[PDB]
């Protein structure tokens, strides 16, 4: 069906990393596996085509191999720009029938720890004059990518109205995330203050915003 790759693979900067792509004789056994790199927000990138041959523009730290019905992608010295998803592909029974692998998410460990900078935005005039209120808690420049966000209304738990994104990198390889509280303009003016509480690495940063003023 699909080529069996490992779900995820980890590797620290500089170390060597290997991704396995196991199949059968009719596909991987055909001896012409290809490897592609997918960085979010970028067009997929072809890495290896001729089982071992590098495409144009590919650095030499990438390398391909095959042993029977199991290919292998090997990065010699892992970089930070190498954090991404990696897919193998092979033809089966015909050149117009291609099969891809389950995919593997490569994680580049070893980044410096960083603490989040948090900002909380109250509903705007525009959003209010349209009968809606949304508090926007933005969380940026932190590592590792695992935060806990809590919403409090007058220091009491908000059990509803919260949609939170999973953290994702930014241009500087640090993580960023966002949480939203969606309220009616009556729930906004109801309470004295609201609080977004971001717990990252034993610390909790609480930003507070009040309807009274700013």
């Amino acid at each position: 069906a699909v080529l069996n790759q490992p779900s995820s693979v980890s590797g620290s900067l500089g170390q060597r990393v290997s991704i396995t792509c196991s199949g059968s004789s009719s596909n991987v056994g055909n001896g012409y596996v290809s490897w592609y790199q997918l960085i979010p927000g970028s067009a997929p990138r072809t890495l290896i085509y001729g089982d071992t041959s590098r495409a144009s523009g590919v650095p030499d730290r990438f390398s391909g191999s095959r042993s029977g019905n199991t290919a292998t992608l090997t990065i010699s010295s892992l970089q930070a720009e190498d954090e991404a998803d990696y897919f193998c592909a092979s033809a089966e029974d015909s050149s117009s029938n291609a099969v891809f692998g389950s995919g593997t998410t490569l994680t580049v460990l070893g980044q410096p720890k960083a603490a989040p900078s948090v900002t909380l935005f109250p509903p705007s005039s525009e959003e209010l004059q349209a009968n809606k209120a949304t508090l926007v808690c933005l969380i940026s420049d932190f590592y590792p990518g695992a935060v806990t966000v809590a919403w409090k209304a007058d220091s009491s738990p908000v059990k509803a109205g919260v949609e939170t994104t999973t953290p994702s990198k930014q241009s500087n390889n640090k993580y960023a995330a966002s949480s939203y509280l969606s309220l009616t303009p009556e729930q906004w003016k109801s309470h004295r203050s609201y609080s977004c509480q971001v717990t990252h690495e034993g610390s909790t940063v609480e930003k507070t915003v009040a309807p009274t003023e700013c």
Binding site: S34, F87, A91, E92, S96, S124, E126, L138, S168
Partner: protein, 264 residues
Amino acid sequence: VQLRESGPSLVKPSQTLSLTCTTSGFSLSDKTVGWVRQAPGKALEWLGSTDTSGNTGYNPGLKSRLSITKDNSKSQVSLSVSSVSTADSATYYCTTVRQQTRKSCPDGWTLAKDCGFYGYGSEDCYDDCTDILSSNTLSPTTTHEFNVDAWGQGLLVTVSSASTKGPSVFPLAPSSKSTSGGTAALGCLVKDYFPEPVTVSWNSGALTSGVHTFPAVLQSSGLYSLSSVVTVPSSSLGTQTYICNVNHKPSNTKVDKKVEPKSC
């Protein structure tokens, strides 16, 4: 060499999705073209291709529903999927592919083409090309070669009975209490819009440093929302205008929003 997908971003169930890839930088009469798609969080899937000889091949599991054509003059490949469902929601990539059916012979033997024989028996392996009529013959070994050469940026297509909806852009103004001395975070809230995607730039691209456009959240309402923030010098909050240029192709909408600083 570049590949640009075009078509609808939303398609109702049971209908037919149709895309067109416009090619440049090369001559469509010299390359094969295909279509790859990836459902969110799922693996790549192969659709089909059409080669220099106008011959089209398809994913065996999806052949009955697929239709790929081409016009070498207009430099344009076309895809069509029939009776789509929510499973057909995916990012559709246009690609230049390298398809080769390859015949190879054991060591010591040689193919008819390399012997220089041609004719009706132009597909066998020969012991010695020195004598075609008395040489021993083997059937060749067949290997199928497949590569995606170049990738197009992709086009996200959603399959839903719900209707298109543009975004509301609300400013995330930087208050004198949400500054961080020297730098201040201001942004734009892109609220309630369907389907994906939204892209955000700042000052018409001229502002790039410090920007981060977050992923989109899927509210219980069935609409998507996201925010785009940029951190800027706090001394410039009155002397440099900051405009976020939102873009939502699924509804041919494009918004520009002044983010003005709060009086407080």
